[PDB]
Amino acid sequence: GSFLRIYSLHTKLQSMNSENQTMLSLEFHLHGGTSYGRGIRVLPESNSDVDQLKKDLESANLTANQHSDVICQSEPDDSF
């Protein structure tokens, strides 16, 4: 659950799969060495960037409009 920043994360689109069917998906890679500024940084909760990340997560959770999980809707019972 940590808030995280990445530096110079490479981005690479697929266009083919191992059965030689064309299909599209976007890969993400942090290749070896800190060259070109590559690295990671564990973000503290004090910075407004982390506030914005958490806020966008909260917004995407509330105004979500996706299909509801936990179809067995009797499961929770709150902090039982």
Binding site: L62, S68, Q73, E75, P76
Partner: protein, 384 residues
């Protein structure tokens, strides 16, 4: 109502010597049971009885609309509903009675008596909240009230067909409380059994939300690491300096500095002092009272006090003040304050241009609104 005064006086001579003698027993009218006073427990447990007796999903999810619902939406539709009984219509008409108290473990008001307790929502009058701390402990009688019952259900019905089946209503919770106007109630002070103080006035800007908060390590005092507890705090501005108990009244203020910073203050309520939440409202002046020996720096500032505690969202602020669990507040409405109180009878509302606009996504609003409907929301509840 049933027997208004003015009946003729009983004359014994006539009662004995009249030929067709008339007396309170001679001619009478049979009486239909006019009213009864329930123990608050039997009222509460009539609520939690009629609620589940009348709860039928096939009336809440009608046809043909219900035919097109997936199970998730079906149960989300069914998972909250409300009932309003108005028990004064029952035969015999039930009459609510109990001593009103403010429960310091929740801040909410309660009607209480020897049989239990019932949460209540008093209103002073239509569109004006209960504002006066002096009602604590009075015996409230109300015979024109609403008994509300909120029902929470965690059903698992697959489709409209199974709404005839019993086995799927896996959990049921009610939440019965009462609500009425003070104008419709009669209020009596309970008699007593039979057989050294400083005060100050202030106006409050606005009142934070009542919720569980954690606190900082005390400044200038023992560093007892706090833990979450129910609390709130109020922004306000002192009026005048400290006053002293003076027999039938409060003496004139001690000299008070004019500095604005010395006027504006954060009253911090936590612990058993939370019982004052329901009475404080913005835009009115309250006379806080502290019993005990008159003491400098009692209201002028916190400055330094034993195990002082500021919440995290209020840490470090200079003009904070922990209200002690044995202090009390009195509503003040004297005419000399009326021009400041002219803010009352009106409530701040932002414009529909402040709302409903892309101008900003970082600021706060206030408005009046009728509620159109309320339902559970699942993504923030369980899905994510």
């Amino acid at each position: 109502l049933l027997a208004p005064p003015g009946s003729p006086v009983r004359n014994a001579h006539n009662e004995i010597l009249e030929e067709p003698h008339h007396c309170p027993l001679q001619k009478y009218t049979r009486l239909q049971t006019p009213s009864s006073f329930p123990t608050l427990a039997t009222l509460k447990e009539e609520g939690q009885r009629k609620a589940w007796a009348s709860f039928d999903p096939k009336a809440l999810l009608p046809l043909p609309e219900a035919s097109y619902l997936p199970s998730c939406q079906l149960n989300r539709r069914l998972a909250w509903s409300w009932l309003c009984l108005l028990p004064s219509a029952f035969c015999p008409a039930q009459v609510l009675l109990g001593v009103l108290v403010a429960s310091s473990h929740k801040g909410c008001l309660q009607l209480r008596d020897q049989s239990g307790s019932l949460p209540c929502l008093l209103l002073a009058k239509h569109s004006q909240p209960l504002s006066d701390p002096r009602l604590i402990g009075c015996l409230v009688r109300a015979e024109r009230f609403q008994l509300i019952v909120e029902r929470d259900v965690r059903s698992s019905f697959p489709s409209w067909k199974e709404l005839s089946m019993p086995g799927f209503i896996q959990k049921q919770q009610a939440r019965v409380y009462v609500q009425f106007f003070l104008a419709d109630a009669l209020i009596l002070p309970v008699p007593r059994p039979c057989l050294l103080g400083q005060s100050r006035l202030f106006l409050l800007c606005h009142k934070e939300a009542l919720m569980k908060r954690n606190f900082c390590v005390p400044p200038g005092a023992s560093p007892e690491v706090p833990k979450p507890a129910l609390s709130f705090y109020v922004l306000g501005s002192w009026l005048g300096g400290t006053q002293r108990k003076e027999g039938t009244g409060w003496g004139l203020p001690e000299p008070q500095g004019n500095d604005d910073n010395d006027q504006k203050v954060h009253l911090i309520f936590f612990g058993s002092s939370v019982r004052w939440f329901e009475f404080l409202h913005p835009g009115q002046v309250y006379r806080l009272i502290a019993p005990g020996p008159a003491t400098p720096m009692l209201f002028e500032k916190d400055g330094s006090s034993c195990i002082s505690r500021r919440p995290l969202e209020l840490a470090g602020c200079a003009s904070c003040l922990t209200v002690q669990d044995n202090w009390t507040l009195e509503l003040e409405s004297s005419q000399d304050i009326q021009d400041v109180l002219d803010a009352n009878k009106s409530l701040p509302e932002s414009s529909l241009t402040d709302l409903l606009s892309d101008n900003f996504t970082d600021s706060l609003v206030s408005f009046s609104a009728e509620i159109l409907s309320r339902t559970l929301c699942e993504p923030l509840v369980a899905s994510l």
